[PDB]
Swiss-Prot record, chain A:
Site keyed Leu-lock: positions: 32
UniProt PTM comment: Phosphorylated by PRKDC at the C-terminus in response to DNA damage. Phosphorylations by PRKDC at the C-terminus of XRCC4 and NHEJ1/XLF are highly redundant and regulate ability of the XRCC4-NHEJ1/XLF subcomplex to bridge DNA. Phosphorylation does not prevent interaction with XRCC4 but disrupts ability to bridge DNA and promotes detachment from DNA.
Compartment(s) of residence: Nucleus; Chromosome
Effect ascribed to mutating residue 49 to A: In 6A mutant; abolished phosphorylation; does not affect ability to repair double-strand breaks (DSBs), possibly because of redundancy with XRCC4 phosphorylation sites
Domains as described in the record: The coiled-coil region mediates homodimerization.
Organs and tissues of expression: Ubiquitously expressed.
Name of the featured protein: Non-homologous end-joining factor 1
Organism of derivation: Homo sapiens
Encoding gene per record: NHEJ1
Lineage: Eukaryota, Metazoa, Chordata, Craniata, Vertebrata
Effect of residue 54 to A/N: Does not affect ability to participate in V(D)J recombination
Positions spanned in the full protein: 76 to 150 of 299
Curated annotation (Swiss-Prot), chain B:
Name by which UniProt lists this protein: DNA repair protein XRCC4
Section covered of the full-length record: 97 to 144 of 336
Organism of this sequence: Homo sapiens
Top-level taxon in the UniProt lineage: Eukaryota
Medical condition linked: Short stature, microcephaly, and endocrine dysfunction: A disease characterized by short stature and microcephaly apparent at birth, progressive postnatal growth failure, and endocrine dysfunction. In affected adults endocrine features include hypergonadotropic hypogonadism, multinodular goiter, and diabetes mellitus. Variable features observed in some patients are progressive ataxia, and lymphopenia or borderline leukopenia.
Tissue: Widely expressed.
Location within or outside the cell: Nucleus; Chromosome
Effect of residue 44 to R: No change in sumoylation
Processing after translation: Phosphorylations by PRKDC at the C-terminus of XRCC4 and NHEJ1/XLF are highly redundant and regulate ability of the XRCC4-NHEJ1/XLF subcomplex to bridge DNA. Phosphorylation by PRKDC does not prevent interaction with NHEJ1/XLF but disrupts ability to bridge DNA and promotes detachment from DNA. Monoubiquitinated.
Family: Belongs to the XRCC4-XLF family. XRCC4 subfamily.
Amino acid sequence: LDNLLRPLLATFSCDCVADALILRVRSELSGLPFYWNFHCMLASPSLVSQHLIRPLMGMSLALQCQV
Amino acid sequence: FEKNLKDVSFRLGSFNLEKVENPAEVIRELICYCLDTIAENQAKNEHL
């Protein structure tokens, strides 16, 4: 999965069941295909907090200091 | 039977088998064939 993703970061399909986002990979390994599915529930607002907002605030103010 | 990548085996297919009651007969057949095969290439190489 890592070897596949790091270049891109094979084909992918995504779908959102009511709340959760479901991510599907169509690829191949050892010549043979590999299928996996990601099952990502809506992330938590502590997670949202820490991963997006507070860092993104941080972005905003740090670039203000830059300016 | 399988395939070895990523330091791991990865199986390709799998067959139901059965032991033959006459091993020696299939053996004669196979190897007569093989004898013929070799001999052919021998003659060809000669001409060449």
